[PDB]
Design a protein around this ligand. Structure first.
Ligand SMILES: [Fe+2]
Ligand code: NA
Ligand code: NA
Ligand code: NA
Length: 60
């Protein structure tokens, strides 16, 4: 669905409240506040870090 905040990974506005573990229906990123705080931290709610996930999404 449309939301009001950008997904940290894909940038599409699918998020209602940042840092509340919403899962993006476009790219699959789970909005874990740890992983937006540290974009190089792997193994949070998502296996990839945010930076890893961003690159993976873009290369599709
Ligand atoms: Fe996304
Ligand atoms: Na984007
Ligand atoms: Na930060
Ligand atoms: Na890492």
């Amino acid at each position: 669905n449309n939301g009001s905040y950008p997904c940290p990974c894909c940038g599409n506005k699918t998020i209602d409240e940042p840092g509340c573990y919403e899962i993006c229906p476009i790219c699959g990123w789970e909005d874990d506040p740890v992983q937006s705080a540290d974009p190089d931290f792997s193994g949070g709610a998502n296996s990839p870090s945010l930076n890893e996930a961003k690159r993976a999404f873009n290369e599709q």
